[PDB]
Amino acid sequence: GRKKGLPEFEESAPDGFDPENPYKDPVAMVEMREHIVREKWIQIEKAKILREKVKWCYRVEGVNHYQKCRHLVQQYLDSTRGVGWGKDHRPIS
Amino acid sequence: RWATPGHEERPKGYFMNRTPPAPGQSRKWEDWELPCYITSFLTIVILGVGLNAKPDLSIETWAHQKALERLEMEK
């Protein structure tokens, strides 16, 4: 019986997972995998908000989008370098 | 040509290639139609009233409220 609202996942690296020997405590391994997936999805939905900002900067500005959206474009392309499970550019998370 | 009434009284050929029933009668249903129609009704009811009423639990909704919160706090 879930309670009405958004899911609640605690935001903290599970203690016990030491990257020297990942296959030492199995319980922390799955928790760490889920956590890493969660921050990767956070960094994806953070890069999509910047895409929305760029999209509505290209439309509101118009012809002057080359100077009024320069800050947004470089921010978006900087947050798109390490999106996630994509091109060979894989972040060291 | 756009005034004359048509010649075809009823559409050519019977629907689903079935002889229409006896006068003052009805198309007697087969042994599968009712158990299949109640199932094709409950399916639509469950999907429409169930998928549109289940909570919006997801990883694209939880993260769109966790990135929208930290993208603000950086300022």
């Binding site: 019986g1 879930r2 309670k3 | 549109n52 009423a53 289940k54």
Partner: peptide, 15 residues
């Protein structure tokens, strides 16, 4: 009163 409320409070109970 309206079906959506009961459906929501039933799906939440099932989950």
């Amino acid at each position: 009163g309206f079906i959506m409320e009961f459906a929501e409070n039933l799906v939440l109970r099932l989950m």
